[PDB]
Write a protein that binds this ligand. Structure first.
Ligand SMILES: NC(=O)c1ccc[n+]([C@@H]2O[C@H](COP(=O)([O-])OP(=O)(O)OC[C@H]3O[C@@H](n4cnc5c(N)ncnc54)[C@H](O)[C@@H]3O)[C@@H](O)[C@H]2O)c1
Ligand SMILES: NC(=O)c1ccc[n+]([C@@H]2O[C@H](COP(=O)([O-])OP(=O)(O)OC[C@H]3O[C@@H](n4cnc5c(N)ncnc54)[C@H](O)[C@@H]3O)[C@@H](O)[C@H]2O)c1
Ligand SMILES: NC(=O)c1ccc[n+]([C@@H]2O[C@H](COP(=O)([O-])OP(=O)(O)OC[C@H]3O[C@@H](n4cnc5c(N)ncnc54)[C@H](O)[C@@H]3O)[C@@H](O)[C@H]2O)c1
Ligand SMILES: NC(=O)c1ccc[n+]([C@@H]2O[C@H](COP(=O)([O-])OP(=O)(O)OC[C@H]3O[C@@H](n4cnc5c(N)ncnc54)[C@H](O)[C@@H]3O)[C@@H](O)[C@H]2O)c1
Ligand SMILES: O=c1[nH]cnc2c1ncn2[C@@H]1O[C@H](CO)[C@@H](O)[C@H]1O
Ligand SMILES: O=c1[nH]cnc2c1ncn2[C@@H]1O[C@H](CO)[C@@H](O)[C@H]1O
Ligand SMILES: O=c1[nH]cnc2c1ncn2[C@@H]1O[C@H](CO)[C@@H](O)[C@H]1O
Ligand SMILES: O=c1[nH]cnc2c1ncn2[C@@H]1O[C@H](CO)[C@@H](O)[C@H]1O
Lengths: 421, 421, 421, 421
């Protein structure tokens, strides 16, 4: 531990490798590059203090450095104990971000470090999973009045915060960044679709083609995971609790059945529900020898590990990010990444170009809070759609794509009723 | 020829073949079969008069006969002059539906027949395109106070009616059936995806694989058309005006460019915009010899025919549903189905199982209007989502699919905010 | 019947509609257009007599007219009683092709007409299924000495002829056109893939997406049918007898099981085996109510109709090209196109651009026989690959595609062994 | 460091992690497990000496240990300097395999180690790329008469050996393992398809979806790479020199153009030609800023590095397995894995289940050489197809898949010629 008042990291001497990772991914993040250039000229966060709980790898680092280049004083804590990249965090510490995170930290350290990040007395909180916003309401009420607002990156976080609002406990405005179009249609679907399979392949070196792949949940993440599994040659089976989404999965060409039926025939299981105990004791009891299980949802409760432990006569670790649960009849079941987001724990998270768009929205949400806090209520808001459209337009221009535009005649037609057959 | 007070059809002696078509598709329409059984027992439309403007083929006939089995007196007019199937209409006339439609009728006959359908003095109007609702407001104001409400099947119709609302001229409640989940996610996407290519293949006998297919519009219809073109081995190019949708198309694996660029390289062009003049003079001037053009949108204004006519030195008709425009330099450009919905004119429309779900929603919308008209304003409404879920559950049960159900613990988890790391 | 010495057709007055079909498809057949222009200038078949057994629709007509434009006297008989298009054959009769074919002709007429075609005393026989070549060996031995050679279009035909060779009964050279690359990789795969689903959709108006589609046989036809079913949103199940092909199907993302297992869960069954009794009594007994069955193989023996008839308490005809077999328990099973090639009987066969390439090979095979008969043995041969490459090059040039070419350096590298690490 | 008569490896203390990798992948290699059980009982290689040049990762290790369990004395050298996994090699040395390989070894060490492996005086040579077979003929002629035969794993190797045969310099029989069905249809296509993208993702953390991916070569490897790129949401462009393969790519839904056209629009370039200078100076000059380039072919000559070096004003190394060539105008072009097989250098090679089947064929080829060398000429042979079928049947049984079997009536039908219409 290289720990001080301003940071706590595993080893500062890793910083040089961290910088290479940050410099690499930033070359492929044009929207955030555009924003950073604007932030550098206008310094909109001069005097502003920002605390962030995010997955601390390269792309996050580039967002945090973008906020800092806009004048912000920035602190950071891990969103997940096992998603932190120690070399990237050393680099952030060297850049003057007040970061407290060590890969594999305990649950107690996780909370201690999050408290240290809060010690900056933030005006803006950027969160991923809602633990930091939740922690401020539960244990750090003294600084509610300093806080202009928070933004939340993920589906699980937004559900928590909307529940806080309904119960009348939310004390400051929150931007649900997850609910922007340029987030959930891209990150949740295309990002998770690719990076889940990157993580699974990386941990296992197994063939995806000709496998029965069971995807639990057919929301934005699940449909991305399913689509990319099919793209890699798998036979995909979807498990859902919503009848409309179940039918969508069928029409998309996938088998649909319940969790017990899927447990009997799955080779690889991926959860993307954001829910608790989607796979549990009775499913593990049905699984084939050698079943691989991974979780893409935010918290490690989707696949219920206490149930696996109770069934197991031995728990082994045959590979990094593979835990073997050997059962009484000799079947071996494999859990990847200790049941935590497999894309972030067994790989490098979403690809750079996806987090570009998500984190461009995050940067703009911070700016929106700065610019609007005095007129917002303690409620959950969504960014105006004009920000989504601006992010899409910068991205399209960076790809060299020029699209058609609506003529005036066309706009008037679409606002008319008289033009029938 | 067979034309009186109660109906107007080409030839009643076609009825036998009409009945066979109706009986066939109804075997594969379980949701509407379920509803029909309920309507037959409870007769919710006893005493009620319903006028419908729909595409008059066999699935429509089954909806209209279902309404009649619920006790309704039913009239009907074509939604499109060229979508009518004369044999199905003969059967409807023999069943006592007051139907006025001849395939290939003129624009003036279309309106005369629509007026004849209105002569029933409807309580409920079921519309597809909003011409009948528009016609009642513009030319048949005498019967407005008899009308409880209307329902509208299609995107183009809903836009017209929302424009009528904004202008303060809408005089009764309208249900935007198009905006239900079980409609636009299934009909607009999967239905149009299949039946567009059915119609193009049927009209042309040409190969889809290894063609450059240009899809104009990447909404629900366009993404279904694109998806199925790719599934048939085409190289798909998407043209869009909305930056977010353009980026979605790129991430789905498709080229994105503007209409002039796409005009130079397209082999087959399909419009799905619901807009005017998406393809016009300067595009036709760029097209390759032998380009095929089709429209999947509601009205025949998407591909601007007056422009083709002005470019043409000859207009020929080499096949049913193919118009050849021979240009000065000798290039020949082909328009399918006279630029009208290609799925409905060159083929048999959406497949039975799709219209099952759309028309189940139509049946439920008619019932919703009956039940609730008194408490609705002269505005556009959307059916409660509970109806969508009920339609999805009946369909899943008919497919023999049993999905997972949420535990109580799970429902509480999803409503909680305290459960973090 | 308009029958004479020179032809036998249903009705000559259909010719005008026939010509429109022929003129249409020929516009999209560039390779055969190229060949026809060469044949017209060089007249390589001046004095030559050609008898053909092919599926008598538009594209075939254009091949036969191409041979005639090369100077050939041409006769023709149906390859299948139900694939004949009466209007196209009227046109051929009017053009001076000696064609004997009526759609729906009996098995006795089929043989009588084939004998009439043979009465031209052919130098070259073009066959599809090997019935005409077989008939000459069995019943018309007098004219073996006149015959330079035969070509065979299809997999089933080639197997028959290779069996004739092995048994020492083949009496003249045969070109296995089916075995050319530009045939089986394109026609058998991409052609059958599209046109099978065209035929199924056309006959039924049912949804392909979210159906369990069972494909029996995973050869060139089967893999095309499977690939396009998946492309239309089906869940595809493959039944195979070859273990290597079964594994290929699994790795392509399809379920693989035996015929009894597939019979229990299939919604739509398609046979492409070229074999006998692939689906028979015990499979029909397992099928779900409303199962649709179609055959894509050459002969109607793949789905064993005598078994369906024995199980049925009623046989009905609810639609053209749909036969209903109603079983004792009330289940209804539907056979399309009377179990004959569904693409040709319920639709218009392969698309024009595919038959362009197949029939360009047929034209070149006729020319190869003309040019080589005196040096060939009574064996089955395959066209030199240079003809395949020439067909591919003409097609690519007609699409405006210019490919890379091998440099001399590269050719030498590929012929070297010394250049290692 | 740990380098003596019997082996040469980086560090023996890595062996523990090597053994874990070997044990892991072997759990998913049922065909080779089956063979190993037979080899252990029958010891077919007792007294036999085998030298192998293969990519030295864990699946290879399992093949080599299988040969050893069959009684063989085994030596091994790297097939590529950068594919070696140091921990796996340590484990092989501890198991008594005479292995000489250090990851990152120079070209001269590569040859020195290959000579050390040859010092065992092999009866059988197992080769990947043909360098070891080539080396024995060129520099170790003294031991030719000890050598019964060689087997060759890869396409590039087989071409070299067929060139050696043609030149009359091949001195012993070679089995072209690459040419077995269960190799090129599975390894070359499905294996390379997955592991190429695994390696590109791992090296770069970039998004595949919505990229223009240029695949150079549309053979078995290229069609697998293209198929999986499309499955990951890329727009795929194929470059080919063979007109038939170019047309296949078009029908598969991909753009086809020449290398200069593709150079202008590609985002990611992957070569799979087995040829020299497919991408060279004039292509690099056309490439967009940030283009990524990777090679999937055997040798690093496909992308011509000397050309990049001459264009570059700086060569940097921003990531492991990424080389940056910064050009005069400021564009940066990135080459992955120093232009060497990207799947094996930037990742872990083909997945376990694929190498199971390829290496099962290798084991059977070694046995075939042992059993039959006396009756083979100094030529290139292909394994009897019965071995392919046996490998496929063991795999299917391990997957729990039971396929249809042919009846006797069916077998007779397929051998008959009399059964026509
Ligand atoms: N790994 C990543 O990088 C990443 C990226 C984005 C989001 N996420 C997380 O993924 C999770 C899902 O997010 P989303 O945006 O797809 O949510 P969503 O609400 O769109 O989808 C979740 C789906 O799960 C279904 N579901 C819930 N409980 C289920 C159960 N027990 N069995 C089957 N289906 C069930 C719901 O019906 C819903 O359709 C959340 O935890 C979110 O925070 C992870
Ligand atoms: N059976 C059928 O043929 C069928 C079925 C359903 C809907 N429809 C009709 O299809 C049309 C589209 O419906 P939808 O539900 O997809 O609507 P939508 O609003 O979901 O999609 C239309 C899309 O077109 C785009 N667009 C508009 N003008 C454009 C232009 N000039 N160039 C390019 N893109 C343009 C918009 O950005 C939008 O994404 C409507 O006319 C609707 O009534 C037809
Ligand atoms: N409809 C058309 O337009 C069209 C086009 C081309 C070919 N064909 C016909 O299609 C048939 C198949 O041709 P192909 O080129 O695909 O042949 P093929 O030899 O490539 O494939 C046939 C496959 O069927 C498998 N098979 C045989 N008996 C089986 C059984 N009982 N159950 C399961 N699998 C079985 C074989 O193992 C083989 O893989 C032939 O009759 C051919 O003449 C039709
Ligand atoms: N694990 C791996 O990375 C892996 C696996 C298997 C094979 N390989 C190697 O991959 C390479 C290709 O193997 P394959 O089995 O696909 O061979 P193949 O012969 O099936 O395919 C090579 C293709 O490249 C085309 N081609 C040749 N020169 C070209 C050029 N200049 N431009 C465009 N196209 C060109 C040829 O027309 C041919 O279609 C070989 O080096 C082989 O040894 C690597
Ligand atoms: O590489 C990455 N860096 C930072 N955040 C990421 C990365 N990959 C995915 N997520 C984010 O993780 C959240 C779930 O906790 C998702 O919302 C996604 O946006
Ligand atoms: O077969 C059909 N019968 C009736 N309506 C149909 C059919 N196919 C599509 N539509 C409907 O046509 C509308 C556009 O006018 C779409 O909204 C779709 O619901
Ligand atoms: O439209 C068509 N015209 C002529 N032949 C066709 C058509 N479609 C498919 N086939 C041919 O029918 C053979 C099986 O008997 C196939 O070999 C195919 O080449
Ligand atoms: O993981 C692996 N181990 C061993 N060989 C491999 C692996 N992945 C691919 N190849 C082999 O590499 C050859 C090209 O040199 C290919 O022939 C393939 O069989």
């Amino acid at each position: 531990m290289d720990c001080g008042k301003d940071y706590c990291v595993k080893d500062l001497s890793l910083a040089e490798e961290g910088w290479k990772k940050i410099d690499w991914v930033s070359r492929f993040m044009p929207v955030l590059q555009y924003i950073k250039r604007e932030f550098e000229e206008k310094k909109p966060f001069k005097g502003v203090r920002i605390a962030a709980t995010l997955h601390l790898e390269m792309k996050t680092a580039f967002l945090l450095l973008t906020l800092k280049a806009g004048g912000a004083e920035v602190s950071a804590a891990a969103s997940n104990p096992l998603s932190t990249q120690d070399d990237v965090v050393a680099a952030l510490a060297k850049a003057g971000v007040k970061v407290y995170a060590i890969r594999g930290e305990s649950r107690e350290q996780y909370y201690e470090f999050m408290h240290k990040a809060l010690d900056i007395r933030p005006n803006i909180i950027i969160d991923d999973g809602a633990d930091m916003i939740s922690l401020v309401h539960k244990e750090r009420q003294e600084m509610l009045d300093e806080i202009w607002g928070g933004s939340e990156e993920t589906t699980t976080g937004v559900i928590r915060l909307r529940a806080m609002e309904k119960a009348g406990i939310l004390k400051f405005p929150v931007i649900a960044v997850n609910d922007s179009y340029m987030k959930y249609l891209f990150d949740n679907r295309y990002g998770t679709g690719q990076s889940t399979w990157d993580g699974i392949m990386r941990a296992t070196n197994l063939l995806i083609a000709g496998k029965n792949v069971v995807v639990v949940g057919y929301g934005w993440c699940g449909r991305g995971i399913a689509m990319r599994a099919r793209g890699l040659g798998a036979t995909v089976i979807v498990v859902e609790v919503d009848p409309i989404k179940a039918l969508e999965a069928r029409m998309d060409g996938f088998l649909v059945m319940d969790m017990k039926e899927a447990a009997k025939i799955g080779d690889i299981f991926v959860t993307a529900t954001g829910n608790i105990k989607c796979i549990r004791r009775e499913h593990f009891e049905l699984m084939k020898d050698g079943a691989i299980m991974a979780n893409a949802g935010h918290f490690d409760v989707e696949i219920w590990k206490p149930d696996l432990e109770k069934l197991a006569v031995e728990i082994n670790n045959p590979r990094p990010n593979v835990t073997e649960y050997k059962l009484k009849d000799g079947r071996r079941l494999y859990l990847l990444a200790d049941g935590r987001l497999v894309n972030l724990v067994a790989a490098d998270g979403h690809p750079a170009e996806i987090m570009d768009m998500s984190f461009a929205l995050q940067a703009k949400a911070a700016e929106y809070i700065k610019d609007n806090h005095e007129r917002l209520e303690p409620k959950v808001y969504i960014l105006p759609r004009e920000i989504d459209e601006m992010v899409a337009r910068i991205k399209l221009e960076s790809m060299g794509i020029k699209i058609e535009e609506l003529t005036e005649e066309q706009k008037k037609y679409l606002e008319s009723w008289e033009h029938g057959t």
